[PDB]
Amino acid sequence: QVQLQESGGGLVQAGGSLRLSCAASPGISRYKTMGWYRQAPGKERSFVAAITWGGLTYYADSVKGRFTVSRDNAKNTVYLQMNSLKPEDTAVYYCSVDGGTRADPYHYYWGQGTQVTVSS
Amino acid sequence: QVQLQESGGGLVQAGGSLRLSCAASPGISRYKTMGWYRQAPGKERSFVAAITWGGLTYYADSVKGRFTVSRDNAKNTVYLQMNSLKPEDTAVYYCSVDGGTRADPYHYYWGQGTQVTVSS
Amino acid sequence: GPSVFLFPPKPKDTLMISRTPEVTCVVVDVSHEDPEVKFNWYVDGVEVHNAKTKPREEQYNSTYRVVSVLTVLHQDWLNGKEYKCKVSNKALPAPIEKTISKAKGQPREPQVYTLPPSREEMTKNQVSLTCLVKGFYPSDIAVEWRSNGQPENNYKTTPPVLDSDGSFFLYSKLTVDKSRWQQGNVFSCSVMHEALHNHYTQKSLSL
Amino acid sequence: PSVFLFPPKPKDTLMISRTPEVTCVVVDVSHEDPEVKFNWYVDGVEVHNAKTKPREEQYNSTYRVVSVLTVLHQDWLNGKEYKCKVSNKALPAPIEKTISKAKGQPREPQVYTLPPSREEMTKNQVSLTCLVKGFYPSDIAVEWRSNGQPENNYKTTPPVLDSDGSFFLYSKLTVDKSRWQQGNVFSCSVMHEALHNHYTQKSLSL
Ligand SMILES: *[C@@H]1O[C@H](CO)[C@@H](O[C@@H]2O[C@H](CO)[C@@H](O[C@@H]3O[C@H](CO[C@H]4O[C@H](CO)[C@@H](O)[C@H](O)[C@@H]4O[C@@H]4O[C@H](CO)[C@@H](O)[C@H](O)[C@H]4NC(C)=O)[C@@H](O)[C@H](O[C@H]4O[C@H](CO)[C@@H](O)[C@H](O)[C@@H]4O[C@@H]4O[C@H](CO)[C@@H](O)[C@H](O)[C@H]4NC(C)=O)[C@@H]3O)[C@H](O)[C@H]2NC(C)=O)[C@H](O)[C@H]1NC(C)=O
Ligand SMILES: *[C@@H]1O[C@H](CO)[C@@H](O[C@@H]2O[C@H](CO)[C@@H](O[C@@H]3O[C@H](CO[C@H]4O[C@H](CO)[C@@H](O)[C@H](O)[C@@H]4O[C@@H]4O[C@H](CO)[C@@H](O)[C@H](O)[C@H]4NC(C)=O)[C@@H](O)[C@H](O[C@H]4O[C@H](CO)[C@@H](O)[C@H](O)[C@@H]4O[C@@H]4O[C@H](CO)[C@@H](O)[C@H](O)[C@H]4NC(C)=O)[C@@H]3O)[C@H](O)[C@H]2NC(C)=O)[C@H](O)[C@H]1NC(C)=O
């Protein structure tokens, strides 16, 4: 079956950096958009970044300038590079294979989640 | 390297009958609906009959009751039985492989056309 | 590959206790080698089983079209309850799940104004009677015209349109024979929307 | 791939001071066949004046290509009828789409202005209404004018099909009740091909 197995979580203090990565089962991500979503307790799961198969990147305003999503199309893995981590960035991060529109997306698959917590 | 070959056209007098047939290349018609269209000189192509792979039949009112479409799914051939032919029925007759909607169909393949003439 | 569409109830069905609101799951582009498709339903992620599946219905394009109807115990949809349809099929690697709910956010009440025909319009044999419904949210609404209590047939209504303030308005035009208007006949515009008291209101209109 | 053909905007075909465009949009172009080719027909004569933008990837990782062809404005008004043909190596035969102005006897709009209902002035903002009815075909344009400068804060419904086969719509202008009360003159201006000079205005004040 399809897996979306993520890695690279942990704890960092404010202003540090961390590289999440998420490997796709073969085929399933090919020609499709891979997106990152994160969820804090007491809030919904919410959008962070996404990269199209052609390299177009989209960011939530909360995180523009500080995170950078990228992708290795050949190995089926997508990456999220987090810089200037601030305590608000504490959450579980789920990666997805996405369709639809930027304003109204459709979520094909979800990874099982990684915790990333940034202490002050 | 012919797809959709129609046959059995010819010349007939009013009130006569004729059995059009159309053989498809292996594969191209399987699970797909096949149609008949006709074009008279001085007019554009227009719909006559169609039969879906599951055997549902559609007709233009011009020919309802008078024409009968049928299909041998295993032989990949569709048949048009024209009865009580009247002088408007003169035209070039094309078979097709169709998709889409009745009101807005989409044509995968076209036959090369056979002339059918109904005398006075 | 087969595709799924999930449709809401009709505004009237959720507004009247006398009517059954239904949520509808449509599967098109089902192929012939594998006709069979799931239906599993969830109101708020708890599985229900009240759904009615009709037999698959062949289409012009030689694909199947399957429909599953779930009837909602009216107050649920009206409460922001969330409904999920999930379909898998041998031609689908993983199931497709679609979700639907009432528009989220604060209901705002409609405002109903009737407008007489313009003084010019009486050179015509029929005058236009106008009802302006504005300031409402969500867009779901039902508007009808009534005279003497009995219904009125000869009216048309615009689709809801987005006003710049983020709410909707529409207009309702009832065409009456000028004689009927001038003889002092009283006409009535009736509007239903959830944000109204009693889910209902009129405004009257007469010479 | 799917294909969508859009008419010119009404304004642009009604005023000579504006250029009407016909627009062909192809979505769901995949990455295995990035290539899309376009053929245009003005009443079955192939043209070649058309502008194809370079394809632009979308959020869902399919492409969207748009080809724009410009109309010899009177042509759209003369009922010239337009055909887009889209070829793509993932489709056996092309997709062809056609579009034109509705045919039939053009009927003149009738423009009525309506004061706000008085139950409305409990608000600081009142709505001014324009009824445009009896018109055919549906291509039309409505604006609100005061003192010559336009009015920004107006909305208009889409044309609706009336029982006689003709169209109507409404246009709602919101003004500050102070503005309504001072005797300010407000103007409903509509353009439509059956109107004299393609134009008429209808004004209204307390
Ligand atoms: C990947 O992501 C893609 C983009 O993110 C996405 O593309 C989208 O694809 C869908 C189809 O799958 C397409 O939907 C069509 O949209 C038509 C209207 O598009 C307008 O308006 C919408 C807002 O409603 C905008 O989103 C569009 O950009 C477009 O804007 C217009 O653009 C032109 C060009 O600049 C301007 O001049 C206009 O002024 C501007 N106007 C507006 C208001 O925006 C819509 O009308 C289509 O409906 C027709 O087909 C439907 C069935 O699919 C029917 O239900 C419906 O009734 C219509 O039937 C048509 O009716 C006509 C009138 O009778 C007939 O002449 C037609 O023959 C008939 N068509 C039939 C029967 O097929 C349609 O829904 C989106 O527009 C498109 N989005 C964009 C931005 O291009 C992909 O789908 C995604 N794919 C995947 C796999 O994820
Ligand atoms: C074989 O032949 C089949 C039969 O003709 C044909 O099925 C057709 O498939 C197309 C697309 O594959 C599908 O198009 C969709 O239609 C949606 C609206 O469908 C309504 O209304 C149309 C008329 O406009 C009717 O034709 C439909 O039957 C359906 O009727 C409704 O049915 C229910 C239940 O019976 C009734 O209760 C309703 O009252 C009734 N409504 C009527 C009669 O008006 C349309 O909204 C869809 O567009 C949306 O998705 C597109 C992407 O695919 C977007 O581009 C577009 O903007 C819309 O986006 C959605 O927007 C929502 C916000 O409002 C979001 O919440 C959604 O998330 C978002 N969806 C997205 C992004 O996916 C879409 O165009 C036809 O409906 C369907 N017809 C039938 C009869 O089943 C097959 O295609 C054919 N296959 C082949 C291979 O040829």
Numbering used by the authors:
A (entry chain D), B (entry chain C): 1 to 120
C (entry chain B): 237 to 443
D (entry chain A): 238 to 443
What are the paper's exact sentences on this?
Immunoglobulin G (IgG) antibodies contain a complex N-glycan embedded in the hydrophobic pocket between its heavy chain protomers. This glycan contributes to the structural organization of the Fc domain and determines its specificity for Fcγ receptors, thereby dictating distinct cellular responses. Unlike other glycoproteins, IgG harbors two glycans which are buried in the cleft between the two heavy chains, and are thus not solvent exposed or readily accessible on the surface of the molecule to conventional probes. We previously described an approach to overcome this challenge and successfully identified synthetic nanobodies that can distinguish fucosylated and afucosylated IgG glycoforms. In the present study, we present the crystal structures of the afucosylated IgG-specific nanobody X0 in isolation, as well as in complex with afucosylated IgG1 Fc.
To define the molecular interactions between afucosylated IgG Fc-specific nanobodies and IgG1, we determined two crystal structures of X0 in complex with afucosylated IgG1 Fc. The final structures were refined to 2.6 Å for C2 and 2.7 Å for P61, and were nearly identical structurally, with an RMSD of 1.5 Å. The only differences observed between the two models are due to crystal packing, resulting in a domain shift in IgG1 around the hinge region (residues 342–343). To verify this, we independently superimposed the N- and C-terminal domains of the two models, revealing an RMSD between Cα atoms of 0.374 Å (N-term) and 0.333 Å (C-term). The contact area between X0 and IgG1 Fc is unaffected. In both complexes, electron density resolved all amino acids of X0, residues 237–444 of IgG1 Fc, and the core N-linked heptasaccharide at N297 on both Fc chains. Additionally, a lack of electron density at the position of the core fucose corroborated the afucosylation status of our IgG Fc molecules. In both crystal structures, the X0-IgG Fc complex consists of two X0 nanobodies bound to one Fc homodimer, reflecting ability of X0 to recognize both open surfaces of the symmetrical Fc domain. Notably, all hydrogen bonds between X0 and the Fc fragment occur within the C’E loop of the Fc, which harbors the N-glycan and is a region critical for FcγR binding. Upon binding, the elongated CDR3 loop of X0 undergoes a conformational shift to access the buried N-glycan and acts as a ‘glycan sensor’, forming hydrogen bonds with the afucosylated IgG N-glycan that would otherwise be sterically hindered by the presence of a core fucose residue.
